Structures are given as C-alpha cells and as structure tokens.
Amino acid sequence: FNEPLNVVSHLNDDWFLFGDSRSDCNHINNLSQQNYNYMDINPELCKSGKISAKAGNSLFKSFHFTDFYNYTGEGSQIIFYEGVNFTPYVGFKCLNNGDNNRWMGNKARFYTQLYQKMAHYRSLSVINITYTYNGSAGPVSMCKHIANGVTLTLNNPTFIGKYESEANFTLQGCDEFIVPLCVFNGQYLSSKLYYDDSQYYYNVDTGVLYGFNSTLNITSGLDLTCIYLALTPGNYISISNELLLTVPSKAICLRKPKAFTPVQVVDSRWHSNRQSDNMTAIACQLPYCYFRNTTSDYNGVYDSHHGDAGFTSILAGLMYNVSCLAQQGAFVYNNVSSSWPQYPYGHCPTAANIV
Amino acid sequence: FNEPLNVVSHLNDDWFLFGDSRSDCNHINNLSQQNYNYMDINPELCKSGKISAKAGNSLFKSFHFTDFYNYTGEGSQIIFYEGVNFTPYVGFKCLNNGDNNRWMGNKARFYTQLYQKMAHYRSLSVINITYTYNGSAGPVSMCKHIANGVTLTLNNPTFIGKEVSKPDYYYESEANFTLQGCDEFIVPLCVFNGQYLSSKLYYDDSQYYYNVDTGVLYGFNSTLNITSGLDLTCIYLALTPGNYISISNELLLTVPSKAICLRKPKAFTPVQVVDSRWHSNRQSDNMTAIACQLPYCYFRNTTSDYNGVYDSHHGDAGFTSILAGLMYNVSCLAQQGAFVYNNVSSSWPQYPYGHCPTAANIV
Numbered sequence: 001f002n003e004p005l006n007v008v009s010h011l012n013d014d015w016f017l018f019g020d021s022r023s024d025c026n027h028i029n030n031l032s033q034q035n036y037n038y039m040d041i042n043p044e045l046c047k048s049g050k051i052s053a054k055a056g057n058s059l060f061k062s063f064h065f066t067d068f069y070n071y072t073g074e075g076s077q078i079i080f081y082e083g084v085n086f087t088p089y090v091g092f093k094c095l096n097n098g099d100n101n102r103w104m105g106n107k108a109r110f111y112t113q114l115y116q117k118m119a120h121y122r123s124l125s126v127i128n129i130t131y132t133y134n135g136s137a138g139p140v141s142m143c144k145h146i147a148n149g150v151t152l153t154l155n156n157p158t159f160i161g162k163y164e165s166e167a168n169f170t171l172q173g174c175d176e177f178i179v180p181l182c183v184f185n186g187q188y189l190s191s192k193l194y195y196d197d198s199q200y201y202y203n204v205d206t207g208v209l210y211g212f213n214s215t216l217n218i219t220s221g222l223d224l225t226c227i228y229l230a231l232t233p234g235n236y237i238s239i240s241n242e243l244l245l246t247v248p249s250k251a252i253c254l255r256k257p258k259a260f261t262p263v264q265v266v267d268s269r270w271h272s273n274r275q276s277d278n279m280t281a282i283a284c285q286l287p288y289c290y291f292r293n294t295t296s297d298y299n300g301v302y303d304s305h306h307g308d309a310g311f312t313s314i315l316a317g318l319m320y321n322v323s324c325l326a327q328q329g330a331f332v333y334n335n336v337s338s339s340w341p342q343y344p345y346g347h348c349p350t351a352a353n354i355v
Numbered sequence: 356f357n358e359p360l361n362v363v364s365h366l367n368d369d370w371f372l373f374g375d376s377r378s379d380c381n382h383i384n385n386l387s388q389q390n391y392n393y394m395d396i397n398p399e400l401c402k403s404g405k406i407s408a409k410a411g412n413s414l415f416k417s418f419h420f421t422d423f424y425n426y427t428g429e430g431s432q433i434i435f436y437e438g439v440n441f442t443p444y445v446g447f448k449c450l451n452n453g454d455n456n457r458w459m460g461n462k463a464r465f466y467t468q469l470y471q472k473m474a475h476y477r478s479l480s481v482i483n484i485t486y487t488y489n490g491s492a493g494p495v496s497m498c499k500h501i502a503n504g505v506t507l508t509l510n511n512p513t514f515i516g517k518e519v520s521k522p523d524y525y526y527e528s529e530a531n532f533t534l535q536g537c538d539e540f541i542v543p544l545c546v547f548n549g550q551y552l553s554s555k556l557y558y559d560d561s562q563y564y565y566n567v568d569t570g571v572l573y574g575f576n577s578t579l580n581i582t583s584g585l586d587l588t589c590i591y592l593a594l595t596p597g598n599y600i601s602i603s604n605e606l607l608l609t610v611p612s613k614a615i616c617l618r619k620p621k622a623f624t625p626v627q628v629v630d631s632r633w634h635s636n637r638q639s640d641n642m643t644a645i646a647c648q649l650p651y652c653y654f655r656n657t658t659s660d661y662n663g664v665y666d667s668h669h670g671d672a673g674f675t676s677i678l679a680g681l682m683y684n685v686s687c688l689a690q691q692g693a694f695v696y697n698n699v700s701s702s703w704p705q706y707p708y709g710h711c712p713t714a715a716n717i718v
C-alpha cells in the first residue's frame with residue numbers, strides 16, 4: 001500500500017510544467033498525422049493553462065539561441081520535462097575547432113542555477129536585455145553551427161565586433177535575473193596559442209564585481225565557457241579589458257518569492273540511436289530537486305522519439321494530486337507506507353508499525 | 356501524544372555542538388565558584404567528545420579576531436549555540452567614525468554562509484592562510500576597538516600598510532595565497548566603505564580575489580552610497596582549493612588570514628541553531644536568525660528573557676530546556692520542533708528531517 005510512485009505530480013492545483021514537443025499541444029497543427037500520440041502528457045491537460053512547451057525547444061536553447069520560445073509560467077510546484085533539444089546529438093560548438101563537451105558543461109551549469117532558483121520563486125519568464133555602448137562597433141554572430149540540416153545561432157551573450165570595451169545594461173522588473181558570463185577558452189588549432197579573453201560584470205550600485213578570464217589550461221578545442229550568475233535589479237557595466245566585449249541579451253526573470261518548494265525534473269532524452277546526456281541529472285540535486293526517469297530506452301510510438309509508454313507513465317501523475325513528494329517518488333496518501341519518505345515535501349506518511 | 360518539542364537533538368549519536376561559555380566544560384577551571392550552573396548543557400555531555408566550545412568566543416569572533424579559538428568538529432547533525440560574544444553590546448567598529456551596524460551585516464552574512472555549508476559537510480575547522488608578497492610593506496592592525504574593558508583586534512583579513520615614507524611605486528598591490536587541505540574554504544572579501552571624518556569625501560577601496568587556475572574573479576569596490584560611518588564591509592566567499600591572487604588595484608591591499616575549512620561531504624542534513632543572546636540588560640541581535648533559514652537550518656528560541664542563575668547571562672532554565680534534547684535521540688527534526696516518535700502526532704512535521712510521524716486520522 002502507498003508505495004512511492006515513479007511520477008511527477010502536485011499537492012494541489014498550483015503547479016506548472018515547462019516542456020518541449022512531448023508536452024506541446026499546439027504542435028499537432030504542424031504535423032501531417034494529426035493526433036496527440038507524439039505527446040507524453042495526457043491531452044486533457046491541454047486546456048489546464050499550466051503548460052509552457054514548444055516543439056523543438058528547451059529552456060537552455062531559448063536562453064542562448066535565436067530559435068527562441070518565450071517560456072513563461074507561474075506556480076508553487078514547478079516541473080520540467082525538457083532538455084533533449086540541446087544534446088550531443090545536436091552537436092553544437094561555436095567554431096569548427098570547438099567542443100561540444102564545453103556546451104554540455106554550460107548546460108549543466110545553466111540548469112543547476114535554474115532548478116535551484118525555481119525552488120524559491122513562483123514565476124519564470126525570459127526577458128530581453130538592452131545595452132548602451134559609446135562606439136560604432138555592432139553585434140556579430142561569432143558562435144554558430146550547422147548540424148542535422150538545422151543552423152543554430154547563439155545570440156546570448158551578444159558579441160560586439162571590433163574599440164570601446166565596455167557597455168552598460170540595466171536589470172529591472174524581476175527579483176533576480178539569470179544571465180550568462182562567458183569567455184572563449186582554448187588554443188587555436190593551427191597555431192596552438194591560447195585565446196585571450198576577459199569579461200567582467202560590475203554592479204555600479206553595490207560595487208560587486210563578477211569576472212571570468214581565459215586561462216592556459218589544457219582543454220584542447222576553442223569554445224565558449226559560460227557561468228550563470230543570479231543577479232539583482234540594478235545598473236551594471238560589462239567590461240572586457242580591451243578584449244572581446246560580450247553583454248547579456250536575455251535573462252531568466254525570476255519573480256514572486258515563495259517558501260522553499262522543490263522542483264521536479266523528468267529525464268529528457270532521445271531514443272538511443274541518438275546521443276543524449278545526463279546534464280540535467282547533474283543539475284537536479286537534493287533538497288531542491290527531484291529527478292524522475294524510466295528504466296528503459298525511449299521507445300516512441302509516434303516516431304522513435306515521441307510517445308513513450310514509460311515517460312507517459314511518469315507524466316501521468318499530473319492528472320491527480322498526491323500527498324507528498326520525495327526522493328524515491330510520490331506518495332499518493334498521507335497516512336502509512338512501507339517505506340520512509342526521503343527528503344519529503346508535503347503531508348507525508350509514516351512507515352512505522354501502527355500498534 | 357508526540358507533540359513537537361522545543362529542543363535541539365539528534366537522530367543518532369553522530370552529532371556535534373559548537374558553543375561558548377554556556378557549553379564550555381573547561382571554563383569551570385577559571386571560575387571562583389566551581390560548579391556547572393553557568394552551563395545551559397547537561398554536564399554529563401562533557402565527556403561525549405561532541406563539543407567544541409570556548410568561553411568568551413564565537414565562530415565569527417575566532418574567524419575575524421586575534422582572540423582565537425580553533426573551533427573544530429565533525430558530525431552528521433550539526434548544532435550551534437553561539438554568537439552572543441559578538442553583539443551590539445560588544446560594540447565593535449574598525450574606527451572611531453565606524454559603525455556597528457556594518458558589523459551586524461557582516462555577522463549575518465558570515466553565518467548565512469556557514470549554516471548553508473554545514474548542511475553539506477561533516478567537518479569544520481579554522482585554518483590559517485599565509486601569503487607571499489614581493490614588497491617591503493607589512494601587516495597593520497587597521498581595525499580595532501576598545502569597549503567593556505576588552506580590546507578587540509581584527510586580524511582577518513590582513514591589511515598591508517603602505518609605507519608613506521617610501522615612493523608610491525614601492526607599494527605592491529597584490530599578494531598570492533594558496534587554499535589547500537579542504538573541500539571548500541570560507542574566506543572574507545572586504546572593503547572600507549563610507550565618508551572620512553569631517554569630510555564629504557568617500558573612502559576609495561578595491562579588493563579582488565582571482566583564481567589563477569580557473570580564471571574566476573570575485574571583486575568588491577567601495578561606492579559612494581550614503582551609509583553612516585566609515586567601516587569594513589565584508590562578503591563571505593566559499594572558495595575551492597587552488598592558487599589565488601589578492602589584488603587591490605593600487606589601493607589598500609587585504610588578504611585572508613583565516614578560513615573555515617569545510618571537509619567530508621554528506622547528503623543534505625539541516626543544521627540546528629539556538630538563539631544566542633544576553634540577558635536583556637545587554638543589547639543582543641537577531642543576525643543568526645536572519646542566517647538560519649529553511650530548508651538548511653532550524654532555529655530554536657525560548658519565549659522569555661535570558662535569566663541566568665549563575666549570573667544574569669549564564670544558566671537559563673528555558674535555554675537549558677532547549678539544550679536538554681542533546682541527551683536523547685529523536686525520530687524527526689522539523690521547523691516547529693523535534694518529534695520524539697516516528698509514528699503519529701497531532702501536527703504535521705514541517706520541512707522534516709528523519710523518520711517522521713503522520714498526523715492523518717488512522718482508520
């Protein structure tokens with residue numbers, strides 16, 4: 001009785017799901033074969049108003065690239081079922097000599113910050129950041145890649161081609177802002193000289209400085225290393241110390257503080273003919289995040305990558321309320337169980353022998 | 356049955372208490388009246404090996420000042436009952452024109468970082484940090500204060516004094532330090548902020564810590580923000596082992612002299628913090644209560660003034676009652692208190708840790 005279930009769910013109505021094609025009810029309108037078997041969610045949820053999901057996209061992808069969806073949503077209990085649309089399969093790197101593994105590190109770091117913060121805020125959206133700059137130099141796309149037909153163009157941060165090496169930006173309208181602070185790092189292939197980059201973000205009001213300089217560390221491959229800062233509203237200066245100037249173009253806008261409420265994350269991966277990664281699992285740690293996964297390959301019924309029975313079974317928990325969320329699963333009832341809930345959230349059952 | 360108790364306790368024997376005179380079993384040897392009524396703990400715990408406590412001290416105090424105790428300890432469940440020995444009563448400020456409020460902010464920030472980290476590490480100690488420096492300038496005690504008899508001398512961070520006798524270019528504004536031997540290190544990054552005495556002009560300071568290996572830079576510059584007084588504002592960084600440079604950009608050079616050494620990672624285990632305050636004839640603060648937040652920390656407090664039996668400030672019945680939980684195991688720790696039993700209760704444990712009872716109507 002009341003064994004922990006391998007589902008994502010909620011204690012009440014106040015939840016929100018962020019997703020991709022597997023949760024995107026509108027995607028049926030752009031398919032030849034018009035039914036919902038491409039979704040891992042129950043289509044009854046299409047009318048809930050509790051989903052922000054876009055076919056072919058992910059939070060990381062909309063954060064960094066021109067192929068942008070305005071993920072927006074508010075709830076107490078936040079659930080993510082996305083990530084697959086930026087994986088080693090997609091194969092992104094800024095340059096020929098680049099390195100997808102760097103971008104996997106970036107993905108892990110981004111989601112670490114996002115999941116942690118969404119345990120403390122109800123509301124997420126993505127906002128544009130504008131800047132002022134007293135030079136003639138303009139933005140250049142120096143990070144882009146073609147793979148699997150599709151061309152991906154990074155547009156966050158902005159690169160200012162060559163020279164004033166600072167720019168002002170304002171963060172306003174949110175409690176906190178997730179922005180990327182990035183430098184190119186690595187050696188040029190033909191020369192084997194390490195690329196020289198520097199990037200500082202300075203808060204004019206507080207005097208606090210975050211910086212990142214390139215180093216000579218063996219990481220063969222030259223590519224963009226990003227760290228993800230959670231900043232407060234204010235006036236900032238972006239400073240590159242006479243090297244390549246970057247400035248944020250987009251931020252995750254965090255609003256409406258809440259008492260600590262763990263997020264739930266569902267493993268987002270391709271069928272095994274495509275290479276996936278475990279970056280979101282690295283990001284999803286206790287006590288702020290519960291991770292859910294099946295024990296089998298993703299075997300889609302619509303096509304290989306869409307409509308899996310195991311993942312449909314995990315997402316099925318959004319159709320009902322549970323008493324308690326925990327490391328090992330969700331407990332439907334609040335009274336007794338055969339196992340002790342670990343790191344629980346909710347009204348949680350006991351596993352004692354009731355006398 | 357099984358109401359939550361206002362105590363600090365533990366699920367098993369793997370706990371450790373950090374304290375002050377109220378938990379310091381050796382302090383009896385320096386008292387004229389030799390009994391343990393000055394302690395809020397049961398003296399049966401003196402032989403546990405689970406206490407690091409020093410009369411007249413606190414973690415913040417040993418971290419920053421020459422009056423130093425090597426707080427050291429390891430456990431799954433960490434408990435703090437200290438803080439009172441750096442309060443508005445002590446009245447510290449770096450300069451005459453300084454501001455104790457700045458130091459209360461520093462205290463809040465330090466304990467915020469400490470409590471958070473001790474939910475993820477078993478082991479805490481305090482280590483010295485040394486530095487190398489290619490100049491002739493030496494360390495100066497630029498932050499010190501006399502109050503209530505006691506003179507307090509800040510020695511963390513170290514200030515490297517400019518020799519104004521010498522040409523300005525002799526003053527090197529960087530120094531190298533290494534952090535080794537811990538998983539993480541808590542260190543202070545500080546600048547002076549405020550206007551000079553009888554002057555409209557703001558003090559100019561800058562301090563950067565740069566990780567040579569990773570390229571990551573943490574910095575802090577003074578600003579022109581209206582504050583009251585000129586004093587030292589500190590932020591507390593959790594850094595990783597590596598080689599660092601401390602850089603002050605031709606202004607006053609500071610470099611850490613001590614770090615909290617964090618070792619032995621553990622699964623998330625909330626800390627317990629007991630309110631550390633004086634009897635109300637002295638001014639206390641709630642900085643440790645600002646620092647102690649869910650889910651990483653449970654805060655415990657009485658509903659009365661601290662009314663010591665040994666003297667005003669030592670041996671309070673309410674705090675003795677809170678600390679009495681260290682004598683036994685409980686099933687579950689939670690926001691509203693500890694639940695002795697794991698089965699049923701009349702209230703729902705909030706943000707619980709352990710084997711927690713249910714408040715459902717059993718059928």
Ligand SMILES: *[C@@H]1O[C@H](CO)[C@@H](O[C@@H]2O[C@H](CO)[C@@H](O[C@@H]3O[C@H](CO[C@H]4O[C@H](CO[C@H]5O[C@H](CO)[C@@H](O)[C@H](O)[C@@H]5O[C@H]5O[C@H](CO)[C@@H](O)[C@H](O)[C@@H]5O)[C@@H](O)[C@H](O[C@H]5O[C@H](CO)[C@@H](O)[C@H](O)[C@@H]5O)[C@@H]4O)[C@@H](O)[C@H](O[C@H]4O[C@H](CO)[C@@H](O)[C@H](O)[C@@H]4O)[C@@H]3O)[C@H](O)[C@H]2NC(C)=O)[C@H](O)[C@H]1NC(C)=O
Binds near residue numbers: 641644645
């Ligand atoms: C740790 O302890 C701290 C300190 O005790 C706790 O912080 C306190 O939390 C309490 C309880 O929640 C808060 O109470 C609420 O206060 C607001 C009013 O807040 C504003 O005014 C405060 C008073 O300021 C005057 O006095 C000082 C001089 O000492 C002066 O500096 C100010 O400039 C100001 O003086 C001016 O106004 C006077 C009249 O008010 C005039 O006479 C005078 O001439 C001047 O013109 C002020 O301290 C406070 O400042 C805080 O907030 C600002 C910005 O938000 C921040 O910048 C500051 O740094 C402070 O953080 C505000 O400006 C009041 O409206 C609330 O009233 C509601 O609830 C009460 C219940 O008591 C009801 O009666 C009401 O009907 C109403 O519903 C409430 O009283 C308190 O603000 C806060 N104090 C401080 C210093 O922070 C903290 O929570 C504790 N933490 C933990 C974990 O325990």
Ligand SMILES: *[C@@H]1O[C@H](CO)[C@@H](O[C@@H]2O[C@H](CO)[C@@H](O[C@@H]3O[C@H](CO[C@H]4O[C@H](CO)[C@@H](O)[C@H](O)[C@@H]4O)[C@@H](O)[C@H](O[C@H]4O[C@H](CO)[C@@H](O)[C@H](O)[C@@H]4O)[C@@H]3O)[C@H](O)[C@H]2NC(C)=O)[C@H](O)[C@H]1NC(C)=O
Binds near residue numbers: 630656658661
């Ligand atoms: C741990 O628990 C203890 C015990 O409850 C708390 O101690 C209290 O501290 C609070 C806040 O500092 C005090 O509240 C204040 O009460 C004042 C008047 O009370 C008198 O009577 C009490 C007995 O009830 C005497 O002990 C005391 O000496 C007093 O003479 C008020 O005038 C204060 O008002 C101020 O703050 C409010 C709140 O924002 C403002 O709106 C006002 O305008 C004004 O600035 C205040 O309400 C209380 O006196 C203390 N009680 C006792 C028994 O000592 C600790 O605070 C708590 N620790 C933590 C960290 O929270």
Ligand SMILES: *[C@@H]1O[C@H](CO)[C@@H](O[C@@H]2O[C@H](CO)[C@@H](O)[C@H](O)[C@H]2NC(C)=O)[C@H](O)[C@H]1NC(C)=O
Binds near residue numbers: 011012013319320321
């Ligand atoms: C889970 O519990 C919530 C209540 O916490 C229920 O949410 C209601 O759903 C309807 C849908 O039309 C809303 O309009 C109501 O306002 C919600 N009610 C409240 C009180 O918030 C939800 O229906 C429950 N789930 C199930 C499967 O019964």
Ligand SMILES: *[C@@H]1O[C@H](CO)[C@@H](O[C@@H]2O[C@H](CO)[C@@H](O)[C@H](O)[C@H]2NC(C)=O)[C@H](O)[C@H]1NC(C)=O
Binds near residue numbers: 132134167168204
């Ligand atoms: C970005 O902001 C800085 C700081 O506000 C601006 O510098 C100020 O500019 C005004 C007008 O030029 C001057 O009067 C001040 O001397 C400057 N202040 C400081 C501290 O340097 C700067 O102009 C802004 N840059 C851009 C590109 O908008």
Ligand SMILES: *[C@@H]1O[C@H](CO)[C@@H](O[C@@H]2O[C@H](CO)[C@@H](O)[C@H](O)[C@H]2NC(C)=O)[C@H](O)[C@H]1NC(C)=O
Binds near residue numbers: 198240241243563602
């Ligand atoms: C981060 O990188 C910047 C750019 O390389 C550094 O600034 C330069 O440092 C070199 C070597 O000291 C100097 O020759 C240049 O004059 C510097 N340029 C400027 C505008 O200062 C900066 O020192 C690095 N930061 C740290 C902390 O090492």
Ligand SMILES: *[C@@H]1O[C@H](CO)[C@@H](O[C@@H]2O[C@H](CO)[C@@H](O)[C@H](O)[C@H]2NC(C)=O)[C@H](O)[C@H]1NC(C)=O
Binds near residue numbers: 277293295297
């Ligand atoms: C989610 O579960 C899948 C299926 O168990 C995991 O994939 C397996 O991982 C094991 C251990 O690495 C491999 O030996 C198997 O070959 C993989 N199986 C399949 C069917 O692909 C996957 O790693 C889990 N996801 C995460 C993030 O841990």
Ligand SMILES: *[C@@H]1O[C@H](CO)[C@@H](O[C@@H]2O[C@H](CO)[C@@H](O)[C@H](O)[C@H]2NC(C)=O)[C@H](O)[C@H]1NC(C)=O
Binds near residue numbers: 425427483536
């Ligand atoms: C405080 O205690 C700790 C732990 O007992 C001391 O750390 C040891 O110090 C020596 C010399 O610095 C190191 O070689 C050992 O590796 C440390 N031991 C451990 C377990 O890490 C520390 O130095 C003491 N601090 C002071 C200022 O005396």
Ligand SMILES: *[C@@H]1O[C@H](CO)[C@@H](O[C@@H]2O[C@H](CO)[C@@H](O)[C@H](O)[C@H]2NC(C)=O)[C@H](O)[C@H]1NC(C)=O
Binds near residue numbers: 421483
């Ligand atoms: C940590 O630093 C303290 C003080 O900063 C060192 O203690 C001093 O050591 C010298 C010579 O070793 C003595 O002459 C002084 O009397 C000591 N001063 C004080 C205030 O105690 C201490 O040795 C250092 N510990 C370690 C392990 O390096």
Ligand SMILES: *[C@@H]1O[C@H](CO)[C@@H](O[C@@H]2O[C@H](CO)[C@@H](O)[C@H](O)[C@H]2NC(C)=O)[C@H](O)[C@H]1NC(C)=O
Binds near residue numbers: 239576603606
């Ligand atoms: C932090 O403070 C330092 C010292 O004031 C600044 O470094 C100097 O900046 C001034 C004013 O812009 C320049 O004229 C100097 O060339 C700098 N001196 C040195 C030795 O580097 C520093 O720029 C401030 N940091 C930031 C990010 O604003």
Ligand SMILES: *[C@@H]1O[C@H](CO)[C@@H](O[C@@H]2O[C@H](CO)[C@@H](O)[C@H](O)[C@H]2NC(C)=O)[C@H](O)[C@H]1NC(C)=O
Binds near residue numbers: 335717
């Ligand atoms: C825990 O709660 C469940 C759900 O309410 C209880 O299950 C009910 O038990 C009664 C009595 O046998 C049945 O008539 C209901 O149909 C049951 N509902 C379900 C969904 O199974 C269960 O009894 C409770 N357990 C305890 C020990 O109190």
Ligand SMILES: *[C@@H]1O[C@H](CO)[C@@H](O)[C@H](O)[C@H]1NC(C)=O
Binds near residue numbers: 070072125126127128
């Ligand atoms: C996304 O939507 C939110 C909510 O409407 C809005 O405030 C924000 O500006 C939008 N983002 C972009 C990039 O247009």
Ligand SMILES: *[C@@H]1O[C@H](CO)[C@@H](O)[C@H](O)[C@H]1NC(C)=O
Binds near residue numbers: 281
């Ligand atoms: C991610 O995968 C790597 C090896 O491929 C493994 O070492 C690591 O444990 C994994 N992390 C998680 C959280 O699954």
Ligand SMILES: *[C@@H]1O[C@H](CO)[C@@H](O)[C@H](O)[C@H]1NC(C)=O
Binds near residue numbers: 353698699
């Ligand atoms: C809970 O446990 C205690 C002691 O272990 C026992 O005496 C009590 O009856 C139990 N209550 C129930 C309802 O099982």
Ligand SMILES: *[C@@H]1O[C@H](CO)[C@@H](O)[C@H](O)[C@H]1NC(C)=O
Binds near residue numbers: 487488531
């Ligand atoms: C600091 O480290 C650098 C290497 O990063 C070195 O060249 C310099 O000599 C060092 N300075 C001191 C005082 O040790």
Ligand SMILES: *[C@@H]1O[C@H](CO)[C@@H](O)[C@H](O)[C@H]1NC(C)=O
Binds near residue numbers: 366367368682683684
């Ligand atoms: C607490 O638990 C441990 C084992 O879990 C036991 O050795 C210890 O003696 C217990 N303490 C008391 C007072 O029962």
Ligand code: NA
Binds near residue numbers: 198199
């Ligand atoms: Na740059």
